[PDB]
Symmetry: C2
Subunit: 191 residues, 2 copies
């Protein structure tokens, strides 16, 4: 019955994502599930553990989702395109993941455990970007530029465009972030 652990985290994630980690009380979590404040504090002794474990659980889900989205795509350009696609804050789960990212970025600057966890996860996905570039390079489908300098650009761009979408910048949308990213690719990465 560590099932109840998981319901607590799935609820916590969703509430942190939609209301803001700091506006969520443990009693908001219990209300949603019908358990007691005491139940929730048994599994997660503080609110910080709640964020840390919900985040760890989602970073696992996102990566699996990614692996299975790219299980066998031989073509290095389609891979990079779909990687880009997996990063768009489409309505629902991916939009929710972005919401947490934004929160995790400020917590990072204050919290070494959240900072560590966030850096491993980012680092892993960044290594995935660069690899795909080195692979696309070796096929001669991509230009021979420092793959790292390139993955840095590409991943910084995805993050900046994401913010523009989530903050409601005029004429931004998920549709427009996708066009933009695909153009950075066609014109700056592709041979």
């Amino acid at each position: 019955q560590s099932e109840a652990r998981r319901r607590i985290l799935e609820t916590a994630w969703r509430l942190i994502a939609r209301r803001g980690y700091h506006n969520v009380r443990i009693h908001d979590i219990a209300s949603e599930l019908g358990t007691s404040n005491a139940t929730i504090h048994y599994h997660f002794p503080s609110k910080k553990d709640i964020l840390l474990e919900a985040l760890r659980r989602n970073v696992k889900l996102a990566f699996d989702r990614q692996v299975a989205e790219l299980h066998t795509i031989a073509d290095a350009r389609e891979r990079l395109v779909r990687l880009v696609e997996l990063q768009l804050p489409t309505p629902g789960l991916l939009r929710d993941e972005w919401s947490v990212w934004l929160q995790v970025w400020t917590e990072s600057t204050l919290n070494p455990k959240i900072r560590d966890l966030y850096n491993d996860a980012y680092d892993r996905w960044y290594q995935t970007i660069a690899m795909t570039i080195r692979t696309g390079q070796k096929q001669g489908v991509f230009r021979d530029q420092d793959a790292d300098e390139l993955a840095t650009r590409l991943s910084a761009l995805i993050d900046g465009l994401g913010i523009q979408v989530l903050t409601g910048k005029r004429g931004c949308s998920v549709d427009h972030m996708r066009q933009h990213l695909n153009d950075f690719i066609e014109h700056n990465i592709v041979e």
Copy 2:
């Protein structure tokens, strides 16, 4: 004696920037200044007004700072270089401004007043980016690409690189963000 208003905001800014808006209590502000919780609530009836006005005050300061940094720089490339420079989270005030930005981005997704204020300020600086590109274009010092599509890229890049610096991504630093941005310029903007 609306002087005390300003001390309250200068203190609030600094505390939100370094500890996180949600970890700051009104009594942390009063302690720092020696006024009462009651004094602070007279000028700012809620904690939200505190963030909204501190943010409004800093967005004015940042823009002035910018105007006077570019009062008369005829040369469209040096302008764009210095604009880039004004955006780096150098230790102290600029690092503090970034800290708030990151907080303002999540508050935006929940708070229409903070969202409005943040969009005007961003929009203003973005218009400044694009103008400088159109000006550099007209001098033939910059390539003729859609200035807006370009300013979007450039400003998304600055934001993504900023996050990497503040979150402590391996091998990132203010020095490296500057090199990177200057290269995006030399190679993607310059003729």
